[PDB]
Paper text:
SARS-CoV-2 Omicron variants feature highly mutated spike proteins with extraordinary abilities in evading antibodies isolated earlier in the pandemic. Investigation of memory B cells from patients primarily with breakthrough infections with the Delta variant enables isolation of a number of neutralizing antibodies cross-reactive to heterologous variants of concern (VOCs) including Omicron variants (BA.1-BA.4). YB9-258 and YB13-292 demonstrate best cross-neutralization abilities towards VOCs, including the Omicron BA.1 variant. RBD substitutions in Kappa (L452R, E484Q) and Lambda (L452Q, F490S) variants abolish YB13-292 binding. To understand neutralizing activities of cross-neutralizing antibodies identified by our activity assays we determined the cryo-EM structures of the most potent YB9-258 and YB13-292 antibodies in complex with various spikes proteins.
Consistent with the mutagenesis analysis, YB9-258 is able to bind Omicron BA.1 spike or RBD without significant change in affinity and maintains neutralization of Omicron BA.1 virus. Consistently, YB9-258 exhibits reduced binding to RBDs of Beta and Omicron BA.1 variants both containing the K417N substitution, while RBDs with E484K/Q, L452R and F490S substitutions have little effect on YB9-258 binding. Residues in CDRs mediate extensive contacts with the epitope, among these many are extra or altered hydrophobic residues introduced by somatic hypermutations. These include F27L in HCDR1, S53A and Y58F in HCDR2, S30G in LCDR1, and F94V, P95L in LCDR3. YB13-292 showed reduced binding to recent Omicron BA.4/BA.5 spike with L452R, while binding by YB9-258 is not affected by recent Omicron variants.
Numbering used by the authors:
A (entry chain H): 1 to 131, 138 to 220
B (entry chain C): 322 to 588
C (entry chain L): 1 to 215
D (entry chain B): 14 to 68, 77 to 142, 153 to 176, 185 to 210, 215 to 247, 257 to 289
Write the structure that this text describes.
Amino acid sequence: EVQLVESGGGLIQPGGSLRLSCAASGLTVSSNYMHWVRQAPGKGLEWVSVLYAGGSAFYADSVKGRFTISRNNSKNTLYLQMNSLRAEDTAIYYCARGLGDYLDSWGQGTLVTVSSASTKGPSVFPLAPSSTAALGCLVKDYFPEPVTVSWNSGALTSGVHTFPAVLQSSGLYSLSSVVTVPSSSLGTQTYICNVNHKPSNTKVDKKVEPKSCD
Amino acid sequence: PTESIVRFPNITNLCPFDEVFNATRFASVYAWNRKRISNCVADYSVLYNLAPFFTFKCYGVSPTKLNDLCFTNVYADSFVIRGDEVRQIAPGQTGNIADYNYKLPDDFTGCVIAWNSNKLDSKVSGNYNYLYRLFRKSNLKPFERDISTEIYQAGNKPCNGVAGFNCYFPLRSYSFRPTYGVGHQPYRVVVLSFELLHAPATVCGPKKSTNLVKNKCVNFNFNGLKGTGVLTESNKKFLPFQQFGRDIADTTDAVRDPQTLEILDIT
Amino acid sequence: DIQMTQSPSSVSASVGDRVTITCRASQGIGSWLAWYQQKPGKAPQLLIYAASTLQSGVPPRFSGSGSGTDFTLTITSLQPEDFASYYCQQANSVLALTFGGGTKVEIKRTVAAPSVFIFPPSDEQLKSGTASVVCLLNNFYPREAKVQWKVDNALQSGNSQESVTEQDSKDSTYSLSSTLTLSKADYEKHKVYACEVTHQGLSSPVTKSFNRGEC
Amino acid sequence: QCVNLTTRTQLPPAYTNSFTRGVYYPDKVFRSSVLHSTQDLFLPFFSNVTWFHVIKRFDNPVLPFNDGVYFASIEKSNIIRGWIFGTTLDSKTQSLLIVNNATNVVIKVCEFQFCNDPFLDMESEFRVYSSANNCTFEYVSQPFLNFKNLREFVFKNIDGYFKIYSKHTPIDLPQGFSALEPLVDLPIGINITRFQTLLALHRSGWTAGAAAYYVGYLQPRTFLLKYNENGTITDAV
Ligand SMILES: *[C@@H]1O[C@H](CO)[C@@H](O)[C@H](O)[C@H]1NC(C)=O
Ligand SMILES: *[C@@H]1O[C@H](CO)[C@@H](O)[C@H](O)[C@H]1NC(C)=O
Ligand SMILES: *[C@@H]1O[C@H](CO)[C@@H](O)[C@H](O)[C@H]1NC(C)=O
Ligand SMILES: *[C@@H]1O[C@H](CO)[C@@H](O)[C@H](O)[C@H]1NC(C)=O
Ligand SMILES: *[C@@H]1O[C@H](CO)[C@@H](O)[C@H](O)[C@H]1NC(C)=O
Ligand SMILES: *[C@@H]1O[C@H](CO)[C@@H](O)[C@H](O)[C@H]1NC(C)=O
Ligand SMILES: *[C@@H]1O[C@H](CO)[C@@H](O)[C@H](O)[C@H]1NC(C)=O
């Protein structure tokens, strides 16, 4: 009977502000303890703030400043105040309710990303197979997360290995995805490489051929 | 040559600090006992000389001037508090203890006394003899105690004392074991409260005396009266329950100390 | 102040086995630990609280006990749906939550050894100003697989980023992909490219070295 | 908790003059063989003192405590026990209580729901109060005690101090002189309006013996005192 709705997340500049909303359906925000959790990709959970049933607010050692909580009883929705950001501040968060020393309720997750760049079109890089076999595409300089890849407009589903996104030292996204093909079907069927995403609305089609001279 | 200190009367009844600091059982955190101490003499030097306490942070008062200034009444609150929560006893602190269990005003006079009690208030297993308030709908008012056995509710629907969802028992039990860490060790904390009113004080403290000087021109100080002369006995037998004598020219000529009740002529 | 560490990192077990997941405590905290389980892409859920009790919604297959310093998460029966990370959580007197590392539970497979399949850079990548070469590893167990690149018989480090794909429901196959970044001026300095891995399934490492400009 | 009385007989108060009875010790400082005048609260000589008699007569009137009261009484077999002082004698004000039973004397100042006839009834019945509440300053002291016993009490309230002077001597008001020695100082500091007393009636309805008491007012007058070489106080002017 408990459900929590999260909104307000998105891509914002590090020198900006964001609005966080945590809506409780069967819970009242001014009668029980409030818990906030954070989880950077590639690692585990971490704690950022806890709001008590009264006018008491607590924060962790790394986030003593630049963070303020404020609840409202007008619509039973929690508001979080933020003014400053860091390079590692991008993560996933789940506002939740619980008792002391343990929490049982949980909510959904809205991704937040901080970067100095903006949305940029991708560039599909073909791969030349060596003359079993492996075939795939290289995705470089695509913004923002996430992206999807389809083989033969979704007809090919066997051997698909969609690797997760990885961040480079320059703060750009690179992704790879390869499939398994046999040597007897190199000149039999042609596979089209489709990479697209909603924010950039790019429509690019790429075909792959085994190398003949180069 | 030298100075003779004031010869105040003998040591009167002592304040019951022995039973407060060495009781066989202390009150609960939420049901903290309220005790008033008055009509005695306060001596904090004897407790400080042994020094079994690890907390002596006090605001507005000093240990050196505790024997000089005094207040109308003394209030004592004794209840077991772990060291993490102890460091939270300051008025400029927030949390579950500072807002749902106990409250201290910004202009609070005095401080609290805490000492290690790992040997007592524990057994081979977890001790569940102490409880504390955890959930409340509002900030706790200072200098008051509320004991509510009703089931705390958090959900929109109200529950009639049942243990269902969205409402549970606000009180929670402690877990005191010898295997716990230093910060989780159970300490015994007593609150020393000072209140000053327009009425005259009844508890301030005792005083000591010195050795007798006879047949010498030594200045004296008897019950706050300053003068110079030679202390010598005489035959001036006086009626009891008096302090000192006088003469025509208001000069003090006789004073009795509440140690031997002698003549002690001034000049 | 308080730091919590988890001794297990990746344990492999079948359905008829005990995970024996434990959480190491630097200080003495007993009967005040809770375990949480989260799925990939899903919200976490509570499993047990106070290290002794069991939640009503949680099935009773989960068991946990600990007196003062050591806790366990032995499970009577392991299910394919119940395969997720576990975290030990300890709170403070000011309700300061602390979360440590996570341990992932899998099944012993060790079916084969990784196969190296290198790919020369495309001709269109030359006009982009950056040249990248990748090599792939597939169906390898365990997670120990060095993806170092040896060019001109010289060791290279801090240039390839590891990427591990997700698990499918039928085969549970793991793959590794690494992207190497080099400037266009540095491509003409070198003459081959190769990546080397060490695995227990192969008696000797397999190195595929292709020269620049042809096979 | 108390029982209301109805058979009280109305009787107008009488006045009997006092003959050099209100002289008491001026201060804690002892002086002797000297002549001095002080500016304190004293009972003027040749004044009028209201006469009250209790025998079937039951009297407990209400008079204002404008200044210190002079309480003299002839007493046998401990007829009276103590006095109560309060603005309205209820739970919304602080009141002082003095109770002396057959064992000891306890001074306890708390708030009580006093009724219009608070009296006492062997001694195993205390109908003087119903219940108590928050208070402080609880003190326990030594007992203060043909007609043969005469007890004289002086009540003063300066700088919040409830100074009481008592003197017991053996024997209307006879002619003579007496000295009121200082016994107990009580720093209580409460508003002063009334000086209602307590009476004890033996139960056999009830029959009480002969008893009387005197009430007077103190005024800031000047008196000359002649002292003795022994240290006692002689007759004044
Ligand atoms: C409590 O007992 C100990 C043990 O003898 C003693 O040292 C201490 O002085 C006692 N406390 C007080 C207030 O006397
Ligand atoms: C005061 O104490 C001393 C030491 O015990 C004793 O000799 C003396 O008699 C006492 N004085 C009174 C008045 O009790
Ligand atoms: C005292 O008062 C009574 C009545 O109030 C009066 O008759 C009497 O004369 C007064 N005494 C003096 C000395 O005036
Ligand atoms: C008698 O008075 C003493 C103190 O004055 C008190 O302790 C005791 O309880 C009283 N007895 C009764 C029966 O009220
Ligand atoms: C009334 O009681 C409260 C708490 O019991 C106390 O703080 C307060 O001082 C009391 N008031 C008086 C006038 O004694
Ligand atoms: C006595 O009454 C006066 C005014 O009637 C008031 O100002 C004063 O505070 C009262 N005394 C006490 C101790 O409250
Ligand atoms: C005064 O004191 C002396 C010495 O004790 C005594 O002999 C004499 O009787 C006293 N005088 C009176 C009037 O009691």
